[PDB]
Design an enzyme around this catalytic site. Structure first.
Site, PDB file in Angstrom:
ATOM      1  N   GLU A 168       0.829  -1.196   0.000  1.00 25.85           N
ATOM      2  CA  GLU A 168       0.000   0.000   0.000  1.00 25.85           C
ATOM      3  C   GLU A 168       0.884   1.275   0.000  1.00 25.85           C
ATOM      4  OE1 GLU A 168      -1.487   0.639   4.231  1.00 25.85           O
ATOM      5  OE2 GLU A 168      -0.286   2.350   3.472  1.00 25.85           O
ATOM      6  N   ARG A 227      -2.051  -3.237  11.510  1.00 26.35           N
ATOM      7  CA  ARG A 227      -2.510  -4.052  10.379  1.00 26.35           C
ATOM      8  C   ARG A 227      -2.543  -3.227   9.084  1.00 26.35           C
ATOM      9  NH1 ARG A 227      -7.628  -3.421  13.337  1.00 26.35           N
ATOM     10  NH2 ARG A 227      -6.131  -1.946  14.304  1.00 26.35           N
ATOM     11  N   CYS A 237       8.153  -0.937  -0.941  1.00 27.06           N
ATOM     12  CA  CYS A 237       9.565  -1.348  -0.928  1.00 27.06           C
ATOM     13  C   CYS A 237      10.122  -1.299   0.455  1.00 27.06           C
ATOM     14  CB  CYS A 237      10.449  -0.428  -1.745  1.00 27.06           C
ATOM     15  SG  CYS A 237       9.721   0.030  -3.252  1.00 27.06           S
ATOM     16  N   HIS A 264      14.052   1.020  -5.463  1.00 27.64           N
ATOM     17  CA  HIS A 264      13.567  -0.218  -4.892  1.00 27.64           C
ATOM     18  C   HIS A 264      14.439  -0.972  -3.932  1.00 27.64           C
ATOM     19  CE1 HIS A 264      11.064  -3.708  -4.702  1.00 27.64           C
ATOM     20  NE2 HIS A 264      12.016  -4.486  -5.202  1.00 27.64           N
ATOM     21  N   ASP A 268      12.025 -10.712  -1.974  1.00 31.04           N
ATOM     22  CA  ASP A 268      11.511  -9.373  -2.117  1.00 31.04           C
ATOM     23  C   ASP A 268       9.991  -9.395  -2.056  1.00 31.04           C
ATOM     24  OD1 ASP A 268      10.545  -6.884  -3.146  1.00 31.04           O
ATOM     25  OD2 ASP A 268      11.060  -7.466  -5.172  1.00 31.04           O
TER      26      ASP A 268
END
EC number: 2.3.1.118
Lengths: 274, 274, 274, 274
Positions: free
Chosen positions: D40, D65, D70, D108, D123
């Site tokens: 998200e 939660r 990344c 990233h 990843d």
């Protein structure tokens, strides 16, 4: 002149400032006081300590619009008269009304004022029969007051206070001119509020004065109105709520106030004791 | 959810709202309380009645930033836990610390909480050794708390409680799961504050808790700081003024407040008795 | 009366409830606020958005024991005065202290209160020289405040404000009675917290008020105490840790809180920028 | 063994503890993670800083939660694998999907794990096409994953990651084995969240993985479900409220939480921008 205190004093007395200490000024302030600040012993019944330092007195009698007795009433009054420029000091006397077998302790406070080369005694805290006007320190002389006639005896150095009743002088309480100290009043208050047999712990007492020789009188649920010294109307309040109201209406009791106020449920627990 | 009360409660606890009643919520609120609202018996010494109705409790413990003891502290705490949704009721127990010859009366209030199908006892009002975290109702199980190890116990319908003292276990108080009523606490407070031999009338007692196993402790002029349960620093305050200050600094006592405040001269009279 | 909010408001102000909206109530709440809730711009420096909806304000200023500026402080204050029954609305004005070449935008929020048929302006969010007591909307009349003398003024529909600096009068901010909307404050906060040249992004600013004309003042590491408007003591905090402590001690900043808290390492990164 | 963190980690992953660092342990934790903690970028859109210190990560990804990208996702994952005993360190790579004219910055994050004398790259934070299972550091070898097929090139020291699509390898992002420092990620996060042209600031992105080659996918209001890598069902959420719901239902987003939660009105202002 007018000090911060003196201010709200006059404000509570619904009266106009006075800066010159004269017998007339006394004459009026006395009656003013007698009609504005009621005689009450409620803090004694709902257990609640009585401070006597000018400040607690200020916040209780003026700001919270509450009453008190000997010590509180004359305590406030003394301050005022002082701030107005009079020459005052308190005196302690012995309540002899009930005509006791042996002299009682110094339960009652009262003021001695030196105005225009004479000595007068002002007292707004005696309750039911308190004076409503200064009196001169002299014997026999049947002195006059808006609500009655009084005569002071001269038994030695000590004096006795009296008032008419069925055509015969009646003694209210004796006293001399000895100096008193704050603590002496604190002790007086301590006695009155805590000595088990003190009558102040056995019934609610309220009493306020009116302009034309009239006065109000509560004794638990027995309310009574008087005119020119006569019992006109006697209501027997039927309930706590109703009484709670009567306290605010007739006596102008400040039932609310962060500090000195009191719920109506509290008044109930108080009258419940009887 | 958050009720008007619950609001300033969290505000006083310097803590963030909680709406879900869980052991963890309890765990923290407890410690929160223990550090925010001090244990104090000052209204007992300067004579001054202790009301226990939620409102007086609210105005004393929250708004005026003052402390209390058994009845007041757990009384406030109980309300909170209730408004937050927990299942609570108070309990009365007997203080057996001094190891008395015969069981003493129900002097101590404490809370019983039903969280996640188990029963815990929270208590923030015991002073010096109060719990600082709920405990489970179970024997032997040496339970742990941010400031100590407490072992609960059995013996019939009653339960004892202890904490590792020196290194042996010293029974504190005890109780049963019997229901109590407000009046039962009023009587408890009456005893504690008025029975002549009650220790609370013979010395000033203050105690506040700190985050890392630390706590503060005042006993008249003997101030003491503790870390991880150890006496680090012990100052003997030299004068009333200085102590008046210490009360506001170290314990964060709301020395002002129209109602529950108290002058420094009042504190002097209180300490003067000793 | 007392709403859920109004509750913890009074609790944070270490003050006693008030239900009657009068100039005197204002007079004190103002000073109350000025001493309880500090002026802080810390959320601007450690990047961290400033919400202005009553709730975020509630959780930041009350529960987390944190400070704010224009928008947050007067925003909270406005709510209180409203819940207490006053007649209020915010106003935006332009900060002209630095004596700018051309009028700056509406950076400053302040309150307009209608009490007893008159109009007053309360403002607790201006920082260093904020008012500490309502003022009447009138020109020339050198009005008095617990921490200074402020003279208001005229000039068309706008009003300037000043305080005795050195001894000459130094215009502070200015404004008009035009209505403002929440968004107008959000934009104001946006400007203040994000416009690159806004001074609030270039140094830590904290300021809290004390009872007797005293106040505290932090500007990065430069701490200063004032009494009756005089620089008594000026400490130059030597390190982040030490400052972290000073924030909690002197200004009573709620350094912890699930939400609005902030680690000491965060404060370091903030001061590191300078 | 199991550390405090490791605890709630497994708890959030709806998975059973693991104490032995082996390829199989990795194999599962990876998929676990991929299905429990969603991808998200919501904190970027509703303006709200992203901390990357293990604690903020713990409180955001586990307790509240919530999801992240990344930096957050692999940040948490790295900690876990570390606490479980693996040998890990992060790596920064360049996102080349859009097939840019010139190499982009190190946007990233990803993990390098040394398990059983070999080197694998795990990843979980790449979003839509993230791996869902460790891969061996080797070229050509078409490696297999629960949700796709990938191939790693060997262009020099630097490597490129690819995955099948229409029968031709497709490069996702390049990267080498150079060491990285927390700050290097903070900078990466700073870029991604604040560089005006960063796509993360122009649309809501959510993505969660399911057990049998399925996955969910939100892109503003475009929701999509996939099975064995196929677009099964594509709903176009009609409103903010409805979406607020979809976030909690389908992705299991912790919409409440003292700290990291967010009102539904806030989500509205966010989608309002588009």
């Amino acid at each position: 002149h007018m000090t911060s205190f003196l201010h709200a004093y006059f404000t509570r007395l619904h009266c106009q400032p006075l800066g010159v200490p004269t017998v007339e000024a006394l004459r009026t302030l006395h009656l003013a006081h007698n009609c504005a600040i009621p005689f009450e012993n409620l803090d004694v019944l709902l257990p609640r300590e009585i401070q006597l330092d000018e400040t607690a007195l200020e916040e209780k009698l003026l700001y919270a619009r509450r009453g008190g007795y000997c010590f509180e009433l004359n305590g406030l009054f003394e301050r005022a008269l002082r701030d107005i420029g009079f020459n005052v000091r308190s005196l302690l006397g012995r309540v002899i009304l009930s005509h006791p077998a042996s002299l009682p302790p110094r339960t009652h406070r009262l003021l001695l004022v030196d105005v225009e080369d004479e000595q007068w005694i002002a007292d707004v805290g005696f309750g039911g029969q308190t004076l409503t006007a200064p009196l001169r320190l002299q014997a026999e002389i049947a002195q006059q007051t808006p609500h009655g006639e009084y005569r002071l005896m001269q038994e030695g150095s000590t004096w006795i206070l009296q008032f008419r009743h069925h055509e015969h002088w009646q003694s209210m309480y004796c006293f001399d001119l000895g100096v008193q100290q704050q603590s002496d009043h604190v002790m007086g208050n301590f006695w009155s509020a805590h000595w088990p047999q003190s009558h102040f712990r056995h019934h609610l007492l309220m009493c306020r004065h009116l302009p034309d020789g009239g006065k109000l009188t509560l004794t638990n649920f027995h309310f009574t109105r008087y005119h020119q010294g006569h019992a006109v109307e006697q209501v027997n309040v039927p309930d706590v709520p109703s009484l709670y109201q009567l306290l605010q209406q007739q006596f102008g009791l400040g039932v609310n106030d962060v500090k000195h106020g009191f719920t109506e449920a509290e008044l109930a627990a108080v009258m419940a004791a009887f």
